[PDB]
Amino acid sequence: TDRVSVGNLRIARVLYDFVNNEALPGTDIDPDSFWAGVDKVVADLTPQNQALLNARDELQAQIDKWHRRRVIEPIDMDAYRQFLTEIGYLLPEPDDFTITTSGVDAEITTTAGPQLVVPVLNARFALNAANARWGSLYDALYGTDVIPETDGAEKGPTYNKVRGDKVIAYARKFLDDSVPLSSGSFGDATGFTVQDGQLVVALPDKSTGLANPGQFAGYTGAAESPTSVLLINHGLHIEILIDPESQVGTTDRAGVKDVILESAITTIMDFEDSVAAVDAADKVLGYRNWLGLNKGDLAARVLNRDRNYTAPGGGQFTLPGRSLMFVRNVGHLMTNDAIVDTDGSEVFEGIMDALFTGLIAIHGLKASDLINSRTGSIYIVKPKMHGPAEVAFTCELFSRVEDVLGLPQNTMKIGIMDEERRTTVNLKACIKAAADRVVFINTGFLDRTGDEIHTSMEAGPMVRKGTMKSQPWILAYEDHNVDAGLAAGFSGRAQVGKGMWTMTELMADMVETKIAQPRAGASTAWVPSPTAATLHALHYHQVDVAAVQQGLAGKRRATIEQLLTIPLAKELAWAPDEIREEVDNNCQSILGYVVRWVDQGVGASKVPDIHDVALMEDRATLRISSQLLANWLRHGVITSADVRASLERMAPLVDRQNAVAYRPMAPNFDDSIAFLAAQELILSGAQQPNGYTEPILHRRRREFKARAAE
């Protein structure tokens, strides 16, 4: 056995060596004490971890049996609520309180802006994400459909000046609405200068200053013909680049080359739903990337240095060139044979992630041969928790890891995903359980939709997938999340965050509708690319999030009844063509994701749906699709033959979109491990714990790896 014995643990050699040779050096942590602590923590906390998972199962069975023993319809919310209280699912709401989290960076406590999520196993994506703190607006407008590709303005192989003018004019309007001139418009500016520490913009027939001179933040170059002008609005920086001999500047009335936005303020390096990591070799690749990110030396293309500026008065100052980094550990469910005990049982992956990503994170608190958290914190997102006891356990785990790492208590801060029903309905108690550690709450609406379907599996058939985004339960869930955060003092102390935009090509749609999120008081929301970060940043220049949160203080906009409104489909409701479309749509989504998961170990993939729209699919959207079909199969909406036919229908189409080093599924379907994984996720969906996809995915990916080795 390629394994190392430490107490009761047998550690995969590749992981043991990585930690000893790469992660421990520079921490001043004694290697023997670390591994002894690994062993101690795993032995102490595994039972409670397991008890919690059994409790999920106890609760789900009592709820299953509750729906089964009643034909009365539609519902007796009074009865259902009393039952949830009786069985300990719905707990008493504690008294009001204010969080006490301290030692947090300004990007979290203060700044409102985009938050980018990226798979940590892909080093190149992770580098671009960390560098996405600044992004070119002209590139993002020219490259996407925010400037429509109408007649004459489409993208070709070389610069289309008609299109670029549209981009320039779009950016002038943005500047006008964000940093207004005293009189006149940026559209007519001819140049910029600094005089007596003030920004002076030259118009055709006069000159003007800023309506708020305080929005002038700095410049580069000679004051009397600068190379760039730096502005701030709503805590976010805008940089106007001036270069008339550049390609775009030659055509511009003021020589303006580009407009740079402070874009992804923070970034979440993901070990969970956007990655596939089923053994020690996978986790080591992830850990190694997370290590180079914190040491500053990851290269695939390198990390950016900080940005240098001249203050208005004349001094020098610096701005961060990198996004402040979070890490998303896996949650409490899965184990991983990267470590096994003497009976051969796998160790809980979440316990491992806290020990190892926390150890690695120490490097980001010290100088890189230039830092992540200047205030001494480690920022871990914790997903897929169910209720305050599960939150308390995470807090205890962090305490024990801090002790093993020699770290001050409460160094390891937690971003609470609100993406499971038992957390939503006890949200205040969950925040209280982490009152000294919590740095955000975030509505992970995709996982939350999966948990909604699974929890009420037995109640009846659910509405279609596309219908879910506007059901009553989800809008109350969204508002109740903001209310609980604001009520716990998150304003000025912690982030209130919302959901991912998954239509990577529908960027005009994103600019037009994602504005709802800061309008609802969210200080941050999730984007999947640096491009999307730059464009989403526009919404924080239009909406004053701090003032919005102020106006919501004390309001109570969601009742417990509304939260508990199950998304049951009404009588009739669907025609045959609509039932067929939803089945086809779900099967292709599942197939396209799973085939790259199982075969190539890619945890996030662009997959076109039945309407040919490109969706960024990850494990959460997979949880929704499989659970929805499982629920339809369970209540007689469709038959097992419909599932099989739809899967066999869509598989050749997926094979075409991948034709790469790719193994087709058709025509020998039952010989493709990926195809059988898709089938299994639907047919066993109702039996997976809380509808989770990781058991089946991890098993099938390991099965595939084993075949590829003989």
Ligand X SMILES: COc1ccc2cc(C(=O)/C=C(\O)C(=O)O)ccc2c1
Residues designated catalytic: 328, 618
Nearest residue to 139 via CA among 510, 531, 509, 504: 531
Considering beta carbons, is residue 254 or 525 the nearer one to ligand X? 525
* Residue selected from 117, 121, 126, 484 as contacting ligand X according to rule CB under 6 A: 117
Considering beta carbons, is residue 278 or 468 the nearer one to ligand X? 468
DSSP string of 292-308?
HHHHT------PPPPEE
Q: What distance in Å separates the CA atoms of residue 622 and residue 651, rounded to the nearest whole number?
A: 16
Does 117 appear as a known binding residue? yes
Task: Please report how close the Cβ of residue 620 comes to Mg ion at its closest, in angstroms.
Answer: 4
- Cross-strand bridge partners of residue 610: none
Considering beta carbons, is residue 147 or 333 the nearer one to Mg ion? 333
Nearest residue to 452 via CA among 475, 480, 429, 419: 419
Q: Is 510 in the site for ligand X (CB under 6 A)?
A: no
Q: Is 502 in the site for ligand X (CB under 6 A)?
A: yes
Given a contact cutoff of 8 angstroms between Cβ atoms, the answer to whether 185 and 549 are in contact is no
Task: Please report how close the Cβ of residue 620 comes to ligand X at its closest, in angstroms.
Answer: 4
* Residue selected from 121, 277, 446, 607 as contacting ligand X according to rule CB under 6 A: 446
Considering beta carbons, is residue 410 or 471 the nearer one to ligand X? 471
Buried b vs exposed e over 274-293: b needs ≥16 C-beta within 10 Å?
bbbbbbbebbbbbbbbbbbb
User: Restricting to residues 610-639, which ones interact with Mg ion according to CB under 5 A?
Assistant: 620
**Candidate ranges 22-30, 215-223, 461-469, 496-504; the one touching ligand X (CB under 6 A):** 496-504
- Classified as helix, coil or strand, 262 is strand
> Binding mask 506-545 vs Mg ion (x if CB under 5 A, - otherwise)?
--------------------------------------x-
> Binding mask 402-441 vs ligand X (x if CB under 6 A, - otherwise)?
-----------------x----------------------
Q: What is the separation of C-alpha 176 from the centre of its chain, rounded to a whole number of angstroms?
A: 31
Does 444 appear as a known binding residue? yes
Considering beta carbons, is residue 114 or 444 the nearer one to Mg ion? 444
* Residue selected from 296, 415, 444, 528 as contacting Mg ion according to rule CB under 5 A: 444
Does 70 appear as a known binding residue? no
Considering beta carbons, is residue 446 or 633 the nearer one to ligand X? 446
Task: Please report how close the Cβ of residue 414 comes to Mg ion at its closest, in angstroms.
Answer: 15
SS3 labels along 421-484: HHHHCCHHHHHHHCCCCEEEEEECHHHHHHHHHHHCCCCCCECCHHHHCCCHHHHHHHHHHHHH
* Residue selected from 445, 477, 593, 704 as contacting ligand X according to rule CB under 6 A: 445
Considering beta carbons, is residue 444 or 567 the nearer one to Mg ion? 444
**Candidate ranges 215-223, 318-326, 440-448, 497-505; the one touching Mg ion (CB under 5 A):** 440-448
Q: Is 500 in the site for ligand X (CB under 6 A)?
A: yes
Sheet hosting strand 225-233, strand order edge to edge: 134-136, 256-262, 236-242, 225-233, 216-222, 307-310, 316-319
Residue nearest to Mg ion (CB): 447
Given a contact cutoff of 8 angstroms between Cβ atoms, the answer to whether 251 and 161 are in contact is yes
- Classified as helix, coil or strand, 115 is strand
Q: What distance in Å separates the CA atoms of residue 358 and residue 362, rounded to the nearest whole number?
A: 7
User: Restricting to residues 609-638, which ones interact with ligand X according to CB under 6 A?
Assistant: 616, 618, 620
Cα dihedral: 529, 532, 533, 535 (round 10)? 160
Nearest residue to 338 via CA among 708, 709, 698: 698
Beta carbons within 8 Å of 97's beta carbon, 6+ residues apart = 432, 435, 488
Task: Please report how close the Cβ of residue 76 comes to ligand X at its closest, in angstroms.
Answer: 30
Does 634 appear as a known binding residue? no
Task: Please report how close the Cβ of residue 65 comes to ligand X at its closest, in angstroms.
Answer: 28
Given a contact cutoff of 8 angstroms between Cβ atoms, the answer to whether 362 and 402 are in contact is no
> Binding mask 665-704 vs ligand X (x if CB under 6 A, - otherwise)?
----------------------------------------
Does 274 appear as a known binding residue? yes
Task: Please report how close the Cβ of residue 382 comes to ligand X at its closest, in angstroms.
Answer: 11
User: Restricting to residues 231-270, which ones interact with ligand X according to CB under 6 A?
Assistant: 270
Task: Please report how close the Cβ of residue 393 comes to ligand X at its closest, in angstroms.
Answer: 20
* Residue selected from 447, 452, 599, 680 as contacting Mg ion according to rule CB under 5 A: 447
Q: What distance in Å separates the CA atoms of residue 279 and residue 169, rounded to the nearest whole number?
A: 51
CA distances in angstroms from 657 to 604, 608, 645, 664, listed in the order given: 15, 9, 19, 11
Task: Please report how close the Cβ of residue 500 comes to ligand X at its closest, in angstroms.
Answer: 4
Pair type for strands 438-443 and 495-498: parallel
- Classified as helix, coil or strand, 140 is helix
Task: Please report how close the Cβ of residue 526 comes to ligand X at its closest, in angstroms.
Answer: 7
Does 125 appear as a known binding residue? yes
Which amino acid appears at position 638 of this protein?
I
Q: Is 331 in the site for ligand X (CB under 6 A)?
A: no
Q: What distance in Å separates the CA atoms of residue 657 and residue 406, rounded to the nearest whole number?
A: 50
Considering beta carbons, is residue 444 or 497 the nearer one to Mg ion? 444
Q: For tokens 């300990």, what's the residue?
A: 88
Given a contact cutoff of 8 angstroms between Cβ atoms, the answer to whether 189 and 203 are in contact is yes
Considering beta carbons, is residue 500 or 598 the nearer one to Mg ion? 500
- Cross-strand bridge partners of residue 237: 232
Binding-site annotation, residues for glyoxylate: 328, 419, 444-447
Binding-site annotation, residues for Mg(2+): 419, 447
**Which residues lie near ligand X (CB under 6 A)?**
117, 119, 270, 273-274, 419, 444-447, 499-500, 502, 528, 604, 616, 618, 620
Binding-site annotation, residues for acetyl-CoA: 117, 124-125, 274, 301, 528
Binding-site annotation, residues: 117, 124-125, 274, 301, 328, 419, 444-447, 528
**Which residues lie near Mg ion (CB under 5 A)?**
419, 444, 447, 544, 620
